Each structure stands twice: as structure tokens, then as C-alpha cells.
Amino acid sequence: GLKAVVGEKILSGVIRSVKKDGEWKVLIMDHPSMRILSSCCKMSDILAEGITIVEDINKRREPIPSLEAIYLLSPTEKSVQALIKDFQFTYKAAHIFFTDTCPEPLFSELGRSRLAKVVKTLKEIHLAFLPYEAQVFSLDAPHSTYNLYCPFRAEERTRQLEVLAQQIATLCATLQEYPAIRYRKGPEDTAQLAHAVLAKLNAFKADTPSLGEGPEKTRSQLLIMDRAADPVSPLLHELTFQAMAYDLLDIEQDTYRYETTREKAVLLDEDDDLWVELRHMHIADVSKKVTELLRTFCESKRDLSQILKKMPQYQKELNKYSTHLHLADDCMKHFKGSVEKLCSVEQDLAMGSDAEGEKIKDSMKLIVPVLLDAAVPAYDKIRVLLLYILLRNGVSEENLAKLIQHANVQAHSSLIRNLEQLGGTVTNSSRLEPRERMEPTYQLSRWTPVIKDVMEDAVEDRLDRNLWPFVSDPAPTRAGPRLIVYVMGGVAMSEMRAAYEVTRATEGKWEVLIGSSHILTPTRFLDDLKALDKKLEDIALP
Ligand SMILES: [Cl-]
């Protein structure tokens, strides 16, 4: 998928293109650059291409003239000024690779340097995005929401749209696409980003006019949506394996930690093929499916005296089964009690109707118990309170104060009101509501992300142009078409799931990719909101 593509562009385009069978090389990097390759290609493949050690430019290093030195950097004044510094000899010579275009000014001061003397290679790969999953990308700019929507960064807003616009143009170019660009009409941001992307995509089209040609690739579309178009989805407690695990449990750097009969630290990425299989399933179908795949593997390899002897051999491939069997139980531990009670209240507020289908009569009566409960943590009370404010489509100033007070979450008053910075409606409307679906589901997972409706419509060529205009109408006349989706201000894990549900529904006709500046859990979303009315010099510039 995306990790295979990105991995190939690196291994073959950067490491293999410089390899000298007799010689070996140091690979030096800045933070953004090494987050990219680390996310797709493994150390074993890196070694196989002729690299002795990997380093980080930001840290002090030892001189090794004997070894030539590759650099893979983002073309920022920090990385370049740090590179120039290495020889003005910490190395004998060096092969440079910028992940994007190097601006005149930075290339000029580099020509007046001593480094220049021993520069052996100098290219630019144009590759600025993390392949998080097979079908989900990230631009590695968690500072993006803050730069676009905080008033203390009003002057950097436009620059942040230009940066993101470029990153999204190099995504298409990487996938050999020249897709029709579309965006949600009302918000100023979505339109501005869409036109920026076209202008920076037309650059790559001009250099390679054969981009996106074909009866199938000509039908590819890139949709741009703002967070405020569906501020409900990022708040909800999802009961699918992934969305549920990252939300309820503490999972950092994508690593799950628990104890066995001793200190296991598993990485939930795409080498773990069991994770790839379960990540999108309701919590209620996980238990069985794990045991269903066990009964296959264990008995497939298998008087049972000899089977006992061969247990150490299976133990490793067999632990990987116990891994997710346990993670599922853990999801269920955290779900019992308050949470299962919250979900009920949330789904009623999101759908606007109880399980029977009967419309909710008194939405206030529904939350009041949860809010005045001292045993429910603040962030949980806040998700319910925000869902209530969104259902009501705004709430009176005085009613908001009485709820914040009676709910006992006064210190977070800030983040609640900060939802108006994204375009959402808190006090006293630009939100899209998912169409109804007459399809059976579990009582606690009746909500479908807005973006799924949008994806299905884009695929079937029935997406309203009034709401989703094109920037350019397609000229009158992998191989299949792609639908690329970019949610501004973070993408929820239900929306990530929606991409896989729609892609599988078309049976391979369409590959639906979705991504954003960063990936969201309900908690990280509230933290992003909290920041929008603060001056924080720690947060990175665009
Ligand atoms: Cl149009």
C-alpha cells in the first residue's frame, strides 16, 4: 500500500541510487525526514542497501572521513544551516537529498560555503508525508490547527495553507495522479486550500504532462473538508477495535503495554497482520474472530503426544494471538461501567433518536445525570456537553454558564468555547448531518461519520456540486481511480475506518485514501481545542 510505495521511493531512489558495493555510508537526518522512512521501511532493508549506521543531524557526531555521508533533510533553514556547519571536516564527502524544493536563498548561501567543495550529489525527491497505514496518510504537522485557527498566529495562517497545499500536491505526484479537486463550499479555508493545491499541482503537471492520463485515472478526485463540517465524529466513543483502543487505553507511539504470566510492549503497526485484520471490527466480533483464526493455525499445524513437544516452536506465532485476545479484554474492561453508560447518551444525542427509532423528546434531561456525576472525569463530561451543544445547534450564553458550573468543569470553560475557532457553533449551523441508513447495527454504534456519505457519493458520481464544487471541470474527452480525502484539523479513527469500508464495498474499483495534518483520538482533539485561545511560543511555525 502506501508504505510499500513510500518505501520504494526511498530505498530505490535514495539509498540504492548511491550504493557502492565496495564502500559503505553514514545516513544523517533531521526529525521530519526520519519519521517518514521509519514509518515504512525496516532497519533490515536499510542495512541491505549499504548503510553502516544511521544518525541525527541535530545531535553532535564524530568525524568519519573514511565513510561518505548521505543526508536526507527537509529544506528548512535549520537543516541546511546545520549541514553547512558539518564542513565549516566531519566527513570526506556527502550526498544530499531534500524532501522538497530548496528555495533560492538557502541554495545560495550553500554555494558560498566550504561544504560545496566536497559535495558529490545533490537531488530532491519531493516526498513530504507519513504513510501511517496502507490507506491513511499524515502530513506530520500537528501544529497545523493552531496555526490556522489561533488568533496569535493569524499572520501564519496563509503560510500554513501554502505549506499544506504543497505537501498535498506532492502526494498526488507520488501516486501518479492529476485528480479533480473539490472542496466543501461555505468555509473560506477549504476553498483557499483547494485553489492552492491546484496551483502547486499544475507545477508537477507542467513538468510531466503525462500525469494522471488514462480512462481510469482521469476520474480520480481529491476532496477537501474542514473539521467543523463534522465536529461530532471526533468526539464519539467508537466501539471498533482501533478507534476504541486508542481512546480508552493509553497508547503512545502506537505502542500497547501490558503484563503477562512479563513486561510486553507490542507495536500496533502493519507488520502485525492480525492487527490489520481486526483494527476495523466492532468490539463484539473481535473475541470470536481471534479464536476462529486460532482454531485454524493451531490445529492446522497439528494421540497428541508429539504436539506437546512442538509447543515451544508455536509459542512465538502463538503469542501474537494472545496479544490481541488480551487487548480486546482490556478494551472491554474500560468499557464496563461509566463508558457503556456514556455511549448510550452520546448515540442518542448524535442520531437524535433513541434505539427504538423514536425521536429524543428531552435532550437536556438526557445529559443532566452525567454532568452532575462526580465520578465522571472532565473530558468525558465535556464530550457529552459538546455533543449536546451541537445537537441543539448552539446554546444560550447563560445556559452554557449554568451547564459549565453545574457540571463542575469550570477550568475547561476555555476549550469548550474554542470550538468556535474551527467554525463550529457553540453560542447561538455549518455542520453536515449524515443521511439516515436503514441498516441493523449494535445499539451503541448507530452513528456513521459524515465523510462516509461523501465518499460513497464521490464513488457513485452523485456528490452534490452545490456543496462540493470543482476547482476545475475535467477536460472533455495501480490503474484504477483513486478518491483522496483531506480533512483539515485532524482525522478521527472512524473516518479512517470509513475509507476501508467504502474501498471494500466497491470491490477494488476505487482505492479510497484519507488523511490529514495529524491523527485524532477524542482526547487529542480536545487538547487541540484547548490551545486555540492561548499564546504558545513552543508550537512550531508552519
Ligand atoms: Cl463546478
DSSP of 54-108: E--TTS-----TTSEEEEEE---HHHHHHHHHTT---SS-EEEEESSPPPHHHHH
Q: Is 383 exposed, middle or buried (0-12, 13-18, 19+ CB in 10 A)?
A: buried
**Claim to verify: residue 81 and residue 132 sit in the same structural domain:** no
Task: Using DSSP, state whether 131 is helix, strand or coil.
Answer: strand
In angstroms, rounded to a whole number, what is the distance separating the alpha carbons of residues 61 and 82?
A: 12
| CA atoms within 13 Å, Cβ hemisphere of 111 | 7
**Local structure of 12: helix, strand or coil:** helix
Q: Which residues pair with 513 in a beta bridge?
A: 484
The set of residues, in sequence order, having a beta carbon less than 8 Å from that of 118 and lying 6+ positions away, is 87, 89, 91, 92, 93, 94
Q: Ligand 1: distance of its center to the CA of 470 in Å?
A: 4
Q: Tell me, yes or no, whether 468 and 541 share the same domain.
A: yes
Compute the Cα dihedral for 126, 130, 136, 141 and give only its sign. Answer: negative
Q: Which three cell numbers stand for residue 133?
A: 497505514
| Alpha-helical runs (H) found in 338-439 | 338-351, 363-371, 378-392, 397-406, 413-417
Nearest to 500 by CA among 271, 277, 321: 277
Q: How far is the CA of 386 from the centre of ligand 1 (A)?
A: 34
Distance CA 339, CA 157 (A): 38
Method: X-ray
Classify residue 357 as left (phi > 0), alpha (psi -120 to 50) or beta: left
Distance 460 CA to ligand 1 centre (A): 17
Question: Which of 387, 418, 448 delimits the end of a domain?
Answer: 448
- Look up residue 186 and give its three cell numbers: 461555505
How many domains does the chain fold into? Answer: 4
Are 380 and 261 part of one and the same domain? no
Residue 473 alpha carbon to ligand 1 centre in Å: 6
How many Å lie between the centroid of ligand 1 and the Cα of residue 496? 27
Q: What per-residue string of b and e applies to 502-527 under the rule 16 or more CB within 10 Å gives b?
A: bbeebeeebbbbbbbbbbbbbebbbe
What is the rounded CA–CA span in Å between residue 387 and residue 197?
33
Domain carrying residue 459: 127-237+449-542
Q: How many residues does the chain have?
A: 542
Query: From ligand 1's centre to the CA of 209, what distance in Å?
Result: 23
Where among 124, 150, 176 does a domain terminate? Answer: 124
Do residue 8 and residue 117 come from a single domain? yes
Cα angle, residue 287 at apex, residues 254 and 449 outer, rounded to 5°? 60
Mark whether 115 and 2 lie in a shared domain: yes
Closest CA to 70 of 143, 149, 137, 14: 14
Q: Supply the CATH number for residue 211's domain.
A: 3.40.50.1910
- For residue 504, the SS3 value is helix
At 357, the amino acid letter reads G
CATH of the domain at 52: 3.40.50.2060
Residue numbers followed by a gap, the chain, C–N over 2.5 Å:
88, 261, 302, 428, 477
Strands, sheet with 68-73, edge to edge from the N-terminal-most edge strand = 51-54, 25-29, 68-73, 94-98, 119-124
C-alpha cell at 38: 521509519
What spacing in Å lies between the alpha carbon of 223 and ligand 1's midpoint? Answer: 13
Cell digits of residue 447: 452513528
SS3 of 512, please?
Answer: strand
Asked if residue 275 and residue 212 are part of one domain, the reply reads no
H or E element in which residue 173 lies = helix 157-174
167 vs 32: CA distance, rounded Å: 13
133 and 163 both lie in a single domain: yes
Query: Could you tell me which of 541, 513, 520 has the C-alpha nearest to residue 137?
Result: 513
Non-local (6+) Cβ contacts of 184 within 8 A are 190, 224, 225, 226, 229, 432, 467, 468
CATH number at 291 reads 3.90.830.10
Ligand 1: centre distance to CA 215 (Å): 21
Co-location of 421 and 480 in the same domain:
no
- CA geometry: angle 396, 401, 407, nearest 5 deg: 120
Task: Say if strands 136-138 and 130-131 run parallel, antiparallel, or are unpaired.
Answer: antiparallel
How many angstroms is it from 465 CA to the middle of ligand 1?
6
Of 94, 124, 154, the last residue of a domain is 124
**Cα-to-centroid distance, 475 and ligand 1 (Å):** 12
Are 52 and 67 in contact, with CB atoms under 8 Å apart? yes
Partner residues linked to 252 by β-bridges: 255
Cβ-proximal residues to 395 (8 Å cutoff; 6+ apart), any chain: 388, 389, 403, 426, 427, 428
Identify the three-state secondary structure at position 164: helix
The overall longest dimension of the chain from CA atoms, in Å, is: 79
The DSSP secondary structure of 269-316, one letter per residue, reads: SSS-HHHHHHTTSBTTTHHHHHHHHHHHHHHHH---HHHHHTHHHHHH
Nearest-angstrom CA–CA distance, 110 and 88:
11
Structure-block grid coordinates of residue 197: 493545491
The dihedral built from the CA positions of residue 229, 235, 240 and 244, taken in this order, carries a sign that is positive
Cα–Cα distances in Å, from 485 out to 214, 294, 458? 21, 36, 10
Residues in CB range of 483: below 8 A, 6 or more apart: 220, 221, 222, 223, 455, 458, 459, 510, 511, 512, 513
d(CA 510, CA 105): 42
State the Cα–Cα distance between residues 122 and 64, nearest whole angstrom: 20
On whether both 57 and 18 belong to a single domain, the answer is yes
Question: How close is the Cα of 471 to the center of ligand 1, in Å?
Answer: 6
Measured CA to CA, the distance from residue 68 to residue 70 in angstroms comes to 7
CA of 160 to the centre of ligand 1 (A): 25
What's the first-to-final CA gap in the chain, in angstroms? 28
Q: How far is CA 476 from the centre of its chain?
A: 35
Q: How far apart are CA 324 and CA 276, in angstroms?
A: 11
Per-residue CA distances from 24 to 10, 29, 316, 318, 529 (Å):
17, 17, 35, 39, 48
CA of 363 to the centre of ligand 1 (A): 39
Sign of the C-alpha dihedral, residues 200, 204, 210, 216? negative
Which residue has cell 501544529? 143
Q: How far apart, in whole angstroms, are the C-alpha atoms of residue 128 and residue 406?
A: 47
Residues 6 or more apart whose Cβ sits within 8 Å of residue 377: none
| Cα-to-centroid distance, 180 and ligand 1 (Å) | 10
Please report, for residues 46, 106, 350, 362, the alpha-carbon distance to residue 436 in angstroms, rounded to integers and kept in the order given: 49, 54, 12, 21
CA-to-CA distance for 95 and 71, rounded, in angstroms? 6
Question: What protein residues have CB closer than 5 angstroms to ion ligand 1?
Answer: 469-470
Q: Are residues 389 and 328 in the same domain?
A: no
Question: How far, in Å, is the centroid of ligand 1 from the Cα of 469?
Answer: 4
Query: By C-alpha distance, which of 473, 435, 471, 423 is closest to 224?
Result: 471
Distance CA 54, CA 38 (A): 11
Residues 15, 120, single domain; the answer is yes
CA-nearest of 354, 410, 408 to 376 is: 408
HSE on the CB side for 389, CA within 13 Å?
26
| 140 CA → ligand 1 middle, Å | 31
Residues with Cβ within 8 Å of residue 344, at least 6 apart in sequence: 443, 444
Q: 205 CA distance to ligand 1 centroid (A)?
A: 21
Q: How far is CA 115 from CA 28, 119, 122, in A?
A: 15, 6, 12
CA separation for the pair 309, 441 (Å, rounded):
45
CA of 210 to the centre of ligand 1 (A): 24
Is the C-alpha dihedral spanning 461, 462, 465, 467 positive or negative?
negative
Give the DSSP per-residue string, 259-270. E---EEEEE-SS
Q: How far is the CA of 463 from the centre of ligand 1 (A)?
A: 11
What is the Å distance from ligand 1's center to 224 Cα? Answer: 14
Q: Tell me the C-alpha distance between 495 and 27, whole Å.
A: 36
Sign of CA dihedral 332, 333, 336, 338: negative
Q: How far does the centroid of ligand 1 lie from the alpha carbon of residue 199, in Å? A: 17
Instruction: Give the span between the Cα atoms of 154 and 411, in whole angstroms.
Output: 26
How, if at all, do strands 221-225 and 255-259 pair?
unpaired
Q: Which of 390, 148, 14 is nearest to 139 (CA)?
A: 148
**Sheet with 511-516, side-by-side order of all strands:** 130-131, 136-138, 511-516, 482-487, 221-225, 180-183
| 476 Cα: distance to centroid of ligand 1 (angstroms) | 14
Can you tell me the distance from the alpha carbon of 345 to that of 338, in angstroms, rounded to the nearest whole number? 11
C-alpha 170 to ligand 1 mean position (Å):
24
The CATH number given to whatever domain includes residue 387 is 1.25.40.60
Rounded Cα distance between 445 and 442, Å, is 5
CA of 54 to the centre of ligand 1 (A): 49
Residue 479, exposed/middle/buried by CB under 10 A (0-12, 13-18, 19+)?
exposed
Output b/e per residue, 17-52; b: 16+ Cβ within 10 A: ebeeeeeebbbbbbebbbebbebbbeeeebeebbbe
Gyration radius of the chain over CA positions: 25
Measured in Å, residue 73 CA sits from the centre of ligand 1 at 39
Domain identity same for 230 and 307: no
What whole-number distance in Å separates Cα of residue 471 and Cα of residue 197?
Answer: 10
Say how far apart CA 220 and CA 53 lie, in whole Å: 41
Nearest to 516 by CA among 447, 462, 468, 451: 451
- The 3-state DSSP composition of the chain as helix, strand, coil percent (nearest 5) reads 50, 15, 40
